Design a protein around this ligand. Structure first.
Ligand SMILES: Nc1ncnc2c1ncn2[C@@H]1O[C@H](CSCC[C@H](N)C(=O)O)[C@@H](O)[C@H]1O
Ligand SMILES: [Ca+2]
Length: 213
């Protein structure tokens, strides 16, 4: 029994099926009252809502699904015929995200691609993608810069394609920011958002010296 399964169970018990906004409320409620989880949250979610509405994407790519909160958030605003692709390297998370999408009624608009972004992005052309309208970066932070460049190299960006990256301050993605800001090929805007709490996995390494080689 994992934290992600508990989140899913809570949504299924409490949210109104077929109601994406109800699902978002349930996840937000559970993760502010019972167990914190790394969803993007409602405050950031409102920023994402405005970006989607302002830029009117038909094909969205999400890097990092986890439990599907941001996938539900974005997919519920898409016009008929529009589609969301979300890449998730953790197959347990992908399985949870699918259940979340089913309960929200959005499975017709979202396709989960299981795998690492650095492996799946060079295949997107094979997946019948020409270019993307909007990309949401919310996976491992050391992938922001390489994946952005990878999207360029693979010809998946068009003039006007929007990149929206989360957590560029906390924990921070300074190399990615230096690239897109400094580069004339990217016009950048920053949106601040206050966080009450965030927990990320970290660790220490102990290394005992055993003598030269
Ligand atoms: N290289 C990679 N390719 C695809 N997914 C990745 C990845 N590196 C990390 N991930 C996944 O990205 C997720 C980050 S948490 C993302 C939360 C989600 N965007 C939301 O707001 O609801 C994790 O589930 C992790 O398994
Ligand atoms: Ca995030």
């Amino acid at each position: 029994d994992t934290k992600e399964q508990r989140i899913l169970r809570y949504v299924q018990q409490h949210a109104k099926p077929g109601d994406p906004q109800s699902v978002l409320e349930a996840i937000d409620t559970y993760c502010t009252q019972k167990e914190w989880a790394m969803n993007v949250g409602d405050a950031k979610g409102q920023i994402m809502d405005e970006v989607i509405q302002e830029h009117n994407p038909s094909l969205v790519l999400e890097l990092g699904a986890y439990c599907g909160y941001s996938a539900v958030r974005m997919a519920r605003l898409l016009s008929p015929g529009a589609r969301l692709l979300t890449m998730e390297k953790n197959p347990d998370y992908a399985a949870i995200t699918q259940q979340m999408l089913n309960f929200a009624g959005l499975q017709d608009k979202v396709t989960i691609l299981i795998g690492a972004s650095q492996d799946l992005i060079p295949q997107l052309k094979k997946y019948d993608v020409d270019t993307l309208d909007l990309v949401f970066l919310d996976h491992w932070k050391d992938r922001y810069l390489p994946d952005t460049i990878l999207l360029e190299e693979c010809g998946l960006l068009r003039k006007g394609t929007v990149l929206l990256a989360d957590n560029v301050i906390v924990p921070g993605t300074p190399d990615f920011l230096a690239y897109v800001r400094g580069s004339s090929s990217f016009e950048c805007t920053h949106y601040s958002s206050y966080l009450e709490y965030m927990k990320v996995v970290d660790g220490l390494e102990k290394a005992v010296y055993k003598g030269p080689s």
